C-alpha cells in the first residue's frame, strides 16, 4: 500500500493495544512472558526508527510506557516499563541520526522534560515513576557525553526537589529509596565529568537558581550552602552529603575548613544561622499534644536546624564556639530549652505527633555527644543552656522507662538504636566537666535500696505486669551503665566486704 490511502492509520488500535501488550509482557505466567517481553522489545526497536521516527504511533507507544511507569499498585509494570524506557533511549539514539533528533517528541530532551514534569508532582507514584525511569536510563547519556553538561545540573537539583516533596509523601513509600538511588547514580557521574572541564557555560538553567549564563559548578554548592537547612529530612541529608563530596574536586582542591572560614569572613557569621535556621528562628499550646500541622512543621524546622551544622561540628569545619558565640543571636538554644521544657507532657494523630517528638530527643543527645567529643572543649557556652537539669532528666527517663516521653514500643529500630545513643552520651559526659549532675540524677531513681525495693517478695508467677517489667527496664539501664563504665559510680559496693554487695545479693536472689 501507498502512503495516501493504502496505508491505514492504525493509531487508534495502537492506543488500546500497547498498554495490554505491556501488561501481558510481565504478568505472571512464564510462557506468556517469553512470548511478549521480546515482542514488546522489538516493537520498541521498530517504532524508534528513522522510518517511523516522528510518527503518531511512536508517540502512542511512548505515552503507553510512561503511563505504565506512573501507575497504581501493579509493581511489575513499573520496572518492566522502566526497562522499556531504557531500550527506547538506547534505540532512539542508536538507530537515529543526530541531526534529526531535534524537534520530534522522541527527542531525549523532550523525554527528559516529561521526566522532570513527572518528578515535580503532588502524586507519589508519578515521582516514583520519574525516579524509576532515571534509575533505568542512568547508564545511558553518560557513556554518551556532550549532553551531561547541559542538564545533569538541572536534573540533580530537581530530583533533590522531588525527594523534598517525597518527604511529606508517606512513610517510606518506596519513592525515597528510588529517588535517593537516582541521585546516587547522578552523583558518580557528575563526580567524573567536569573534573577537567569545569567551565562556566550557558548550561540549561535549573529550577530554583538565580538567572545566569555561567553556572559551571560553584552555583550548585553555593545553593547547597544557601538552603540545606530545609526541613525535608532525606533531601537535606543527601544535600549535606553532596556538599561534603562536592567541596573537594574544585580548583585548588581546597578544604571545607577554609571554605567555611572564607564564607564566614566574606558574608558574616550570621550567614551560617539564617541559612541554618530558615524560617525556624521566628508557641505555648505545643506543651499539650496538638493535632495542628503547624506544631509538627515547627518540630521539623527545629530538627533541620539541629542537624544541619551539627554535622558541620561533628566534622572539623567550624566549632560550636564560633557558631554559638555572641555573634549569631539565634533561637537555637532558646528553642532547644523550650522544647526540653514540656515534652514529657485524636490519638491517631496523637502518635503522629508523639513519634516526631521522639525523633528529635535522640538528635539532641547525639548533638551533645558531638559537642563533648570535639577539641574546642569548654562548657561555658553551654553550661546551663540545654545541658542543665532537665536534659539530664530526659537522659535518665530515656535510659529507663522510655515509654514515658512517648517512645513507641512498636518502633523496633528506634528503640534498638536508643541504648547506643544513651551509652554514647553517658560515656561522653564521663569526661565532661559537669558529671556530678548526671550522678545525682541517676541516683535519684536507680540505686541499691531502689533495687531491693523493686526486688519484691514475689517475682515469678502471673504478675508479669509490674514485677517483671520495671525490673527488666532497670536491669537494661544497669547494663547500659556497665557499658558506659558507670556501674560502680552509681552503685558502689560496701567498704566492708570485697565482693560487690549489690551483686552478691542479686546473685543470691536469683539463685534462691
Amino acid at each position: 500500500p501507498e502512503g495516501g490511502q493504502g496505508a491505514p492509520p492504525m493509531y487508534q488500535l495502537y492506543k488500546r493495544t500497547f498498554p495490554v501488550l505491556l501488561r501481558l509482557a510481565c504478568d505472571v505466567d512464564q510462557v506468556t512472558r517469553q512470548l511478549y517481553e521480546p515482542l514488546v522489545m522489538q516493537l520498541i526497536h521498530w517504532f524508534t526508527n528513522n522510518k517511523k521516527f516522528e510518527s503518531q504511533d511512536t508517540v502512542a507507544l511512548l505515552e503507553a510506557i510512561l503511563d505504565g511507569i506512573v501507575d497504581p499498585v501493579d509493581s511489575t509494570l513499573r520496572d518492566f516499563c522502566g526497562r522499556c524506557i531504557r531500550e527506547f533511549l538506547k534505540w532512539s539514539i542508536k538507530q537515529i541520526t543526530p541531526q534529526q533528533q531535534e524537534k520530534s517528541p522522541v527527542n531525549t530532551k523532550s523525554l527528559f522534560k516529561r521526566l522532570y514534569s513527572l518528578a515535580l508532582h503532588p502524586n507519589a507514584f508519578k515521582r516514583l515513576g520519574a525516579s524509576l525511569a532515571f534509575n533505568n536510563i542512568y547508564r545511558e547519556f553518560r557513556e554518551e557525553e556532550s549532553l551531561v553538561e547541559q542538564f545533569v545540573f538541572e536534573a540533580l537539583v530537581i530530583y533533590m526537589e522531588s525527594l523534598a516533596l517525597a518527604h511529606a509523601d508517606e512513610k517510606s513509600l518506596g519513592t525515597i529509596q528510588q529517588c535517593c538511588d537516582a541521585i546516587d547514580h547522578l552523583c558518580r557521574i557528575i563526580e567524573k565529568k567536569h573534573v577537567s572541564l569545569n567551565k562556566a557555560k550557558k548550561r540549561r538553567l535549573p529550577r530554583g537558581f538565580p538567572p545566569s549564563a555561567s553556572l559551571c559548578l560553584l552555583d550548585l554548592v553555593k545553593w547547597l550552602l544557601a538552603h540545606c537547612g530545609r526541613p525535608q529530612t532525606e533531601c537535606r541529608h543527601k544535600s549535606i552529603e553532596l556538599f561534603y563530596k562536592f567541596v573537594p574536586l574544585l580548583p585548588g582542591n581546597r578544604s571545607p575548613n577554609l571554605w567555611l572560614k572564607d564564607v564566614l569572613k566574606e558574608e558574616g557569621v550570621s550567614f551560617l544561622i539564617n541559612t541554618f535556621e530558615g524560617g525556624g528562628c521566628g508557641l505555648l499550646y505545643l506543651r499539650g499534644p496538638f493535632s495542628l500541622q503547624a506544631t509538627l512543621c515547627w518540630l521539623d524546622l527545629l530538627l533541620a536546624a539541629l542537624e544541619c551544622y551539627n554535622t558541620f561540628i561533628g566534622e572539623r569545619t567550624v566549632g560550636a564556639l564560633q557558631v554559638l558565640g555572641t555573634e549569631a543571636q539565634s533561637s537555637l538554644l532558646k528553642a532547644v530549652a523550650f522544647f526540653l521544657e514540656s515534652i514529657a507532657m485524636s490519638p491517631q494523630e496523637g502518635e503522629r505527633y508523639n513519634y516526631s517528638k521522639c525523633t528529635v530527643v535522640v538528635r539532641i543527645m547525639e548533638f551533645t555527644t558531638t559537642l563533648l567529643n570535639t577539641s574546642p572543649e569548654g562548657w561555658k557556652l553551654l553550661k546551663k543552656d540545654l545541658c542543665n537539669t532537665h536534659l539530664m532528666r530526659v537522659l535518665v527517663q530515656t535510659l529507663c522507662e522510655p515509654a514515658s516521653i512517648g517512645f513507641n514500643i512498636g518502633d523496633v529500630q528506634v528503640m534498638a538504636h536508643l541504648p547506643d545513643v544513651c551509652v554514647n552520651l553517658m560515656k561522653a559526659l564521663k569526661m565532661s566537666p559537669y558529671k556530678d549532675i548526671l550522678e545525682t540524677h541517676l541516683r535519684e531513681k536507680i540505686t541499691a535500696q531502689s533495687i531491693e525495693e523493686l526486688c519484691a517478695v514475689n517475682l515469678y508467677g502471673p504478675d508479669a505486669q509490674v514485677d517483671r517489667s520495671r525490673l527488666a527496664a532497670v536491669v537494661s539501664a544497669c547494663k547500659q551503665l556497665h557499658r558506659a563504665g558507670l556501674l560502680h559510680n552509681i552503685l558502689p559496693s560496701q567498704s566492708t566486704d570485697l565482693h560487690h554487695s549489690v551483686g552478691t545479693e542479686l546473685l543470691s536472689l536469683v539463685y534462691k
Binding site: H45, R114, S117, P122, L205
Partner: protein, 1265 residues
C-alpha cells in the same frame, strides 16, 4: 530483533479456531463474521433464484433453531438473531420465536434490533406486540408510548394499562387487562391474537408484581384448561405454554406453598415431569431453585443440595456467557445470587448439628439477615419478595425443629424484614403492595410500643407518598386518616425518651398539615364542599382562617422537629423542610399585599436564613442550590434580620460558595454588601484563583455612591484588589490575551460607541473625554501600547496608515461636533479592512505567550476553568500553565475568535477558545443555570434512574470584552457528523446542486417574494399560505438522505446492543437539552450549536448568545420554534417516532423542573442585579416564571414576538403562524396557561415539528436536516 510479520495463515487461523473452541463469545463472533462474509461473497455468482432458495432454506433452519432450543444459550440465540439482523432476506424470521428466545436468555437488545429492522422495509401488529413485549421486559416504558398508538391498529385500553404500569400501579393495570380479556362486544373490530396474548402475559406480570399468588395461580392455570385443570402434562403440550404459564404457575404455587398452604399438587407435577428427559432438562436448567425450595418443603435436604448447587453452576455458566457490554442483563442475572446463597446458607445451618441446640448461632443468623437486604430503589419487588418469603420459610422450619423467647426472637426479625420491604416498596412506588403488606402486619404492630410507632410512621409516610398523584379532595382524605392515629399517646416511656421517633412524628405531622393546607389553598372550598365529619377536622373564619391555622400547626410541628433534631443527615432534612416551607409561605405572601400577613410571617425570614446556613455548615447540596434565595431574602428584608445572616455566614466553610462567587462580587457596591465581605475576603486569600476573574469584571464597574458609609465600601474593595493579582502576572496575562484579538474589531467597538454618543445628538457630556483615553491607548498612537503593554507588531503600521485621517481625528475631532457627517469614519473603518491582516498564523502575534516559559515562582497561572464548586478545591492538583502552542487557529465568524491550545504543567495539551470582543457573563450565567438544573435534575427519582444530566463546559470571563471558554476534547459538531456520514455523491448533491434544499429554499423565497436577500421573509409570511409552505417543505426535505444519524451511530457501534445504547443516549440527551433550552429560552440552535461527544454519543449545547428569548425578539427573521427537533432526529428513532423516548424524557425533566420552580427563578436574578451589555431583565424572568408554572408555549412565543416585532410589516402573520391552526396543531387547541406537564410537552413538540413553521425559518438554521 524485529517483528516477524512473515506469518502463516495457519499461525493465525489455528489459534483463532483454538480460542473459538474454548470461549463461546469468540465462537459467536467468529461464526457471525464467517457467515456474513460467505453470504456476502455468494452474491457475486449464484444468481437470484438459487440464492433466494438458499436464503429460504436458511430462514427455515433458523426458525427451526429458535423453535427447537430448550437451553437458551445466550451466545447461540444472539448469534442467530444478529446474523438475521445483518441480511434483509433473513429479517422475517419468527417474531414470536425471536421474542421468546431473546426474552428467556436476557438478550433483549438483539431481539429489539431484529424486530425494529424487520418493522422497517395493514400494520404488522404481531411484530409491534413482540417489540413491546421485549421493551417492557427491560423496563423502557418511555419507548412504550410511540408503540401503542391507534394507527398500528391497537385498542386504547392496552395503551392506558401500559401507562398505568409506567408508574408502579399494577392494580389498575391488571384491572384493565382482565377487563380487556373479558370484553365481548368490541365494536371497532376484533383484537388480534397477538394483542390478546400480550394482555394475558401482562396480566400475569401484574399479578406477579402485586403478590396475589391466588390470582397468579388461577390466571396461569385457567388458560390451559378448566374444571380443576390438569397441569400434569398439558403445559408441556402447546409449546407456547412453556414460556408463558410454566414460570408463573411454578412461581405462584411455590410462593403459595411457602406460606403454609397444605396443597400437594405442584409436587406431583414436578415428580411426573422428571420422568421425561426433555422436561427434566428444562425443569432443572431454568429453575433449580424452585426445585430446591420445593424439596426443602418435603424436608428432602439432599435433593435441595443437589438442585441449589446445580443452580449456582447454571448461574455461573449463564452469567459468564452474557456479553460484557450487555449491562442490565448481568444486573438481573446477579439479582438472584442472594436468594441462591441464602438457600445454601439455610441448608448448611440446618444440617450442622452444632447449631439448633444452642441459641447463639440462631442469633448470629438473625443478625446477619437483618443487616443483609436487597437494594432499595433498584432491586425490583420480586427480588425482595423472594428474599423475605424464603427467610420467613427458613425461620419457620428452624422454629419447628428447635425444641430447646425464641418465638419472639424470630418474630422480631420477621417484623423488621417486612418493615424494610415496605419502605423499599414505598420508595419504588409499589403503593398497592406496600398497603397490602402493612395490612397483615397491623396486628403485631400494637403488641409492642416501638413497633406501633414505627408502623404508624411508615403508614403515614406511605400515605404522604401516594398523596402526590391524587388531585385534590381525595388526598386530604388520605392524609386525614393519618392524624387520627398519628396522635396516639406513644409517650408511654418511648417518645418521651426516644428523640429520633419524636422528630419523625413531628415531621410527619407537619407534612400532613402542610398537605391539607396546600390542597385547600389549591381548591379554596371545593374540597370542603364534600365534607361531613371533615369540616370539624379542617376547622381545627371558614375560608382563610382555616388555612392560616393549618399552616400555623404545620409550622409548630416543623419547628419542634428542628429543635428536637438540634439536640448525621438526620438534621439536614429538618433544616431544609423548615427552610423550604417557610420560604414557600414567603413566596405565597409575596404576590399579595397585607399587614397582618406580615405580622404572622415576620418570624420566617430570619428563621429561613439561619436554618439554611446551618444546613450549609453541614455538607448539603440541596441547600447550596438554595443559596441565591438567601440573597433575595436580604434585599427584601434589609431593615431587619440582616446581621443574623452575618453571624451565620461568618462560620460556614470557605469553599462552600465558590459556585456563587459571581453572585457575591456583584453585591460589593450596594448598601448591604456586608454579610458577604467575610466570605469573599477569606476566599480571596484562601483560594486566590477562584475569585480573581469574577472580581475583575465586577470591580470594572461598581460605581459606588459614597452617601452614608461609602468609605469602608471602597476600602474593602481596594484591600481585596491589593490582595489579588499577586503582582502583575494575571494582569499582563489578560493584556497579552487581549492583544491578539483583531484590533479592527475593537475599532468597530469604539465606532459603535462614538456613533451612539455624538453622531446622534451633541447632548452627551464628558463621555467623549472619557473615551478619549482609550482610542489613543488602543489602536491609536503606536507609542501608547508600547508604553502600556507589549506593543503589538501592527499598531506602528496602523499609525503609519492612520495618519492623514488620524491627524484630524486627534487634532480637531476632539470637538468635531458636526454630528451629521460620518462618511469619513465609515470609509476609514472600511479601509482598515483593505490593508487588514487578521490572522496571526503563529504565536508571535502576542509576544508574551509565545515566550511565556515560566522561570520564576511568579504565582503560576493555574489554567482557568477549575474550582467547579463541589468539594474542597485542593489547588495543588489544578493544572498550571506551562506554555502555549505556537499555532493558533481562527474560527470563521464576523467576531473572528481564536481558539488557542495551551500546554499545562502536566505536558498534556488543553484546547481553549478566546473571544476578546464580547461580555461572556451571559454565557457564564447560563452555564451555572445548567449546573442548578442538573443539580435539581439529579434529585428527582425519575430523572435519576435515567441519569439525566446536562453537559457543561467552563466559561471563564477574563474581563469585559475578553473571555475564555474551555474546548471539550474529541467532540464534533452535528453538521460535520451529518456531512461526513454521507457518501461523496450525496455530499456533492447536497452542497453543489441547485435542486438541493440549500438552493431550493432560496429559490423558493425568491420566486414567491421577488427578493433575493433578507427581508424576503417579511413578505413571504404575508405570501405563501400554510398549504404551499408545507408542500414546499415536504418536497425539500424529501431530498436529503433520511438516515444520516442512523448510519453514523451504526458505524461507531460495532454491535446491536451498542447501537441501541448510543441511540437511546443521544435521544435522551437531546430531549433533555431541548426542554432545558426551552425553559430559559435559547434560540439559534443551528446545526453547529450542537456538539456530539464521539466517545459516548451524548449531545452538548453550545453558544448561548441568544440566552433568553431574543432570536424571536431581536432578529430580522424571528425564530418560532422552541428547540431543534427536525427530520433527522425523528428518523433516528424509526420505526418508533418522537412520541416515545423523547416525549417521556421531556415529561420527566419538566416534572422535575416544575416540582420547585423557585430554584431557576431565584438564580436568574443576577441578570437584573448586574445586567450585561447584550424592564429588560425583569420581563425575561417573568416569562421564564410563566412558562415554568404551566403555560402554552405558543402563547409565550406570541408574547415575545409582540414585544419584539410589534408594528412590523408582517407581525400579524408572525403571530398567526406561531399560534397554530386550531385544526392541525394541538398547541392552538389548548388553554393559554394553567397547563399540565404532559400537555405542555405535547404543544411544545407540536410547535417544534411544524412544517408551517419549519418551512419558513432562517435559511442558516438548516430546517430540512
Amino acid at each position: 530483533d524485529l517483528p516477524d510479520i512473515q506469518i502463516k495463515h495457519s499461525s493465525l487461523i489455528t489459534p483463532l479456531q483454538a480460542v473459538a473452541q474454548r470461549d463461546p463469545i469468540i465462537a459467536k463472533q467468529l461464526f457471525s463474521s464467517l457467515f456474513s462474509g460467505i453470504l456476502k461473497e455468494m452474491d457475486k455468482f449464484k444468481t437470484l433464484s438459487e440464492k433466494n432458495n438458499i436464503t429460504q432454506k436458511l430462514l427455515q433452519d433458523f426458525n427451526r433453531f429458535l423453535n427447537t432450543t430448550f437451553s437458551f444459550f445466550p451466545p447461540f440465540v444472539s448469534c442467530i438473531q444478529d446474523i438475521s439482523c445483518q441480511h434483509a432476506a433473513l429479517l422475517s424470521l419468527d417474531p414470536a420465536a425471536v421474542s421468546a428466545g431473546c426474552l428467556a436468555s436476557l438478550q433483549q437488545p438483539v431481539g429489539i434490533r431484529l424486530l425494529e429492522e424487520a418493522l422497517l422495509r395493514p400494520p404488522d401488529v404481531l411484530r409491534w406486540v413482540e417489540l413491546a413485549k421485549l421493551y417492557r421486559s427491560i423496563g423502557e416504558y418511555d419507548v412504550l408510548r410511540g408503540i401503542f398508538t391507534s394507527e398500528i391498529g391497537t385498542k386504547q385500553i392496552t395503551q392506558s394499562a401500559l401507562l398505568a404500569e409506567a408508574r408502579s400501579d399494577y392494580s389498575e393495570a391488571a384491572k384493565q387487562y382482565d377487563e380487556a380479556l373479558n370484553k365481548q362486544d368490541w365494536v371497532d373490530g376484533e383484537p388480534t391474537e397477538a394483542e390478546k396474548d400480550f394482555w394475558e402475559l401482562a396480566s400475569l406480570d401484574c399479578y406477579n408484581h402485586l403478590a396475589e399468588w391466588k390470582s397468579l395461580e388461577y390466571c396461569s392455570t385457567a388458560s390451559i384448561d378448566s374444571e380443576n385443570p390438569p397441569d400434569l402434562n398439558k403445559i408441556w403440550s402447546e409449546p407456547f405454554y412453556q414460556e408463558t404459564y410454566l414460570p408463573y404457575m411454578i412461581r405462584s404455587k411455590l410462593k403459595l406453598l411457602l406460606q403454609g398452604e397444605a396443597d400437594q399438587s405442584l409436587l406431583t407435577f414436578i415428580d411426573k415431569a422428571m420422568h421425561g428427559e426433555l422436561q427434566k432438562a428444562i425443569l432443572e436448567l431454568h429453575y433449580s431453585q424452585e426445585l430446591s425450595l420445593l424439596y426443602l418443603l418435603q424436608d428432602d435436604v439432599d435433593r435441595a443440595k443437589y438442585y441449589i448447587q446445580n443452580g449456582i453452576q447454571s448461574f455461573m455458566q449463564n452469567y459468564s456467557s452474557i456479553d460484557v457490554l450487555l449491562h442490565q442483563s448481568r444486573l438481573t442475572k446477579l439479582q438472584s445470587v442472594q436468594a441462591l446463597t441464602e438457600i445454601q446458607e439455610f441448608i448448611s445451618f440446618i444440617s450442622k448439628q452444632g447449631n439448633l441446640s444452642s441459641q447463639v448461632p440462631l442469633k448470629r443468623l438473625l443478625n446477619t439477615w437483618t443487616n443483609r437486604y436487597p437494594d432499595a430503589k433498584m432491586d425490583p419487588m420480586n427480588i425482595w419478595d423472594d428474599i423475605i418469603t424464603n427467610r420467613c420459610f427458613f425461620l419457620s422450619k428452624i422454629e419447628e425443629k428447635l425444641t430447646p423467647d425464641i418465638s419472639s426472637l424470630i418474630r422480631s426479625c420477621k417484623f423488621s424484614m417486612k418493615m424494610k420491604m415496605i419502605d423499599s416498596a414505598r420508595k419504588q412506588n409499589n403503593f398497592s403492595l406496600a398497603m397490602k403488606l402493612l395490612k397483615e402486619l397491623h396486628k403485631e404492630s400494637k403488641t409492642r410500643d416501638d413497633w406501633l410507632v414505627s408502623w404508624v410512621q411508615s403508614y403515614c409516610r406511605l400515605s404522604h407518598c401516594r398523596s402526590r398523584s391524587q388531585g385534590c379532595s381525595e388526598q386530604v382524605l388520605t392524609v386525614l386518616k393519618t392524624v387520627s392515629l398519628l396522635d396516639e399517646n406513644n409517650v408511654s416511656s418511648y417518645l418521651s425518651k426516644n428523640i429520633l421517633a419524636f422528630r419523625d412524628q413531628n415531621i410527619l405531622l407537619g407534612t400532613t398539615y402542610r398537605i391539607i393546607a396546600n390542597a385547600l389553598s389549591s381548591e379554596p372550598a371545593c374540597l370542603a364542599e364534600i365534607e361531613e365529619d371533615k369540616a370539624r377536622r379542617i376547622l381545627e373564619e371558614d375560608s382563610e382562617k382555616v388555612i392560616a391555622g393549618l399552616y400555623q400547626r404545620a409550622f409548630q410541628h416543623l419547628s419542634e422537629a428542628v429543635q428536637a433534631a438540634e439536640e448525621a443527615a438526620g438534621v439536614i432534612d429538618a433544616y431544609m423542610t423548615l427552610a423550604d416551607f417557610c420560604d414557600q409561605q414567603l413566596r405565597k405572601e409575596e404576590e399579595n399585599a397585607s399587614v397582618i400577613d406580615s405580622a404572622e410571617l415576620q418570624a420566617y425570614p430570619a428563621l429561613v436564613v439561619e436554618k439554611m446556613l446551618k444546613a450549609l455548615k453541614l455538607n448539603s447540596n440541596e441547600a447550596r442550590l438554595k443559596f441565591p434565595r438567601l440573597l433575595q431574602i436580604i434585599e427584601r428584608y434589609p431593615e431587619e434580620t440582616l446581621s443574623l445572616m452575618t453571624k451565620e455566614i461568618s462560620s460556614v466553610p470557605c469553599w462552600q460558595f465558590i459556585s456563587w462567587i459571581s453572585h457575591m462580587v456583584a453585591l460589593l457596591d450596594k448598601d448591604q454588601a456586608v454579610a458577604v465581605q467575610h466570605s469573599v475576603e477569606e476566599i480571596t486569600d484562601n483560594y486566590p484563583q477562584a475569585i480573581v476573574y469574577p472580581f475583575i469584571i465586577s470591580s470594572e464597574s461598581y460605581s459606588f455612591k459614597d452617601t452614608s458609609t461609602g468609605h469602608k465600601n471602597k476600602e474593602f474593595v481596594a484591600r481585596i484588589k491589593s490582595k489579588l493579582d499577586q503582582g502583575g502576572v494575571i494582569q499582563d496575562f489578560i493584556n497579552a490575551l487581549d492583544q491578539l484579538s483583531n484590533p479592527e474589531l475593537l475599532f468597530k467597538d469604539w465606532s459603535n460607541d462614538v456613533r451612539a454618543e455624538l453622531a446622534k445628538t451633541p447632548v452627551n457630556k464628558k463621555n467623549i473625554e472619557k473615551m478619549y483615553e482609550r482610542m489613543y491607548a488602543a489602536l491609536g498612537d503606536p507609542k501608547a501600547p508600547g508604553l502600556g503593554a507589549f506593543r503589538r507588531k501592527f499598531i506602528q503600521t496602523f499609525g503609519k496608515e492612520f495618519d492623514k485621517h488620524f491627524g484630524k481625528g486627534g487634532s480637531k475631532l476632539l470637538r468635531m461636533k458636526l454630528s451629521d457627517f460620518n462618511d469619513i469614519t465609515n470609509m476609514l473603518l472600511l479601509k482598515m479592512n483593505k490593508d487588514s491582516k487578521p490572522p496571526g498564523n503563529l504565536k508571535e502575534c502576542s509576544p508574551w505567550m509565545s515566550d511565556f516559559k515560566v522561570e520564576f515562582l511568579r504565582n503560576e497561572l493555574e489554567i482557568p476553568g477549575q474550582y467547579d464548586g463541589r468539594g474542597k478545591p485542593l489547588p495543588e492538583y489544578h493544572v498550571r500553565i506551562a506554555g502555549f502552542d505556537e499555532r493558533v487557529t481562527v474560527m470563521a465568524s464576523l467576531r473572528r475568535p481564536k481558539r488557542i491550545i495551551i500546554r499545562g504543567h502536566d505536558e498534556r495539551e488543553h484546547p481553549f477558545l478566546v473571544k476578546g470582543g464580547e461580555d461572556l457573563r451571559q454565557d457564564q450565567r447560563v452555564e451555572q443555570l445548567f449546573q442548578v438544573m442538573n443539580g435539581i435534575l439529579a434529585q428527582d427519582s425519575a430523572c435519576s434512574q435515567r441519569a439525566l444530566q446536562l453537559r457543561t463546559y467552563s466559561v471563564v470571563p477574563m474581563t469585559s470584552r475578553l473571555g475564555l471558554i474551555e474546548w471539550l476534547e474529541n467532540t464534533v459538531t452535528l453538521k460535520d457528523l451529518l456531512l461526513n456520514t454521507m457518501s461523496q455523491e450525496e455530499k456533492a448533491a447536497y452542497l453543489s446542486d441547485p435542486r438541493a434544499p440549500p438552493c431550493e429554499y432560496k429559490d423558493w423565497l425568491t420566486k414567491m417574494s421577488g427578493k433575493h436577500d433578507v427581508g424576503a421573509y417579511m413578505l413571504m409570511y404575508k405570501g405563501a399560505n400554510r398549504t404551499e409552505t408545507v408542500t414546499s417543505f415536504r418536497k425539500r426535505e424529501s431530498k436529503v438522505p433520511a438516515d444520516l444519524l442512523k448510519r453514523a451511530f451504526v458505524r461507531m457501534s460495532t454491535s446491536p446492543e451498542a447501537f441501541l445504547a448510543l441511540r437511546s443516549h443521544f435521544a435522551s440527551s437531546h430531549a433533555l437539552i431541548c426542554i432545558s433550552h426551552w425553559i430559559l429560552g435559547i434560540g439559534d440552535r443551528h446545526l453547529n450549536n450542537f456538539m456530539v461527544a464521539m466517545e459516548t454519543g451524548g449531545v452538548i449545547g453550545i453558544d448561548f448568545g441568544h440566552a433568553f428569548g431574543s432570536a424571536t425578539q431581536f432578529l430580522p427573521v424571528p425564530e418560532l420554534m422552541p428547540f431543534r427537533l427536525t427530520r433527522q432526529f425523528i428518523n433516528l428513532m424509526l420505526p418508533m417516532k418522537e412520541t416515545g423516548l423523547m416525549y417521556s424524557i421531556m415529561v420527566h425533566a419538566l416534572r422535575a423542573f416544575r416540582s420547585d420552580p423557585g430554584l431557576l427563578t431565584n438564580t436568574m436574578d443576577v441578570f437584573v442585579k448586574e445586567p450585561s451589555f447584550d424592564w429588560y431583565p425583569r420581563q425575561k424572568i417573568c416569562y421564564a416564571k410563566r412558562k415554568l408554572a404551566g403555560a402554552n408555549p405558543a402563547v409565550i412565543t406570541c408574547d415575545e414576538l409582540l414585544l419584539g416585532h410589534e408594528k412590523a410589516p408582517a407581525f400579524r402573520d408572525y403571530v398567526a403562524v406561531a399560534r397554530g391552526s386550531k385544526d392541525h396543531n394541538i398547541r392552538a387547541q389548548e388553554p393559554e396557561s394553567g397547563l399540565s406537564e404532559e400537555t405542555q410537552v405535547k404543544c411544545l413538540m407540536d410547535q417544534a415539528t411544524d412544517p408551517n413553521i419549519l418551512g419558513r425559518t432562517w435559511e442558516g438554521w438548516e430546517p430540512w436536516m
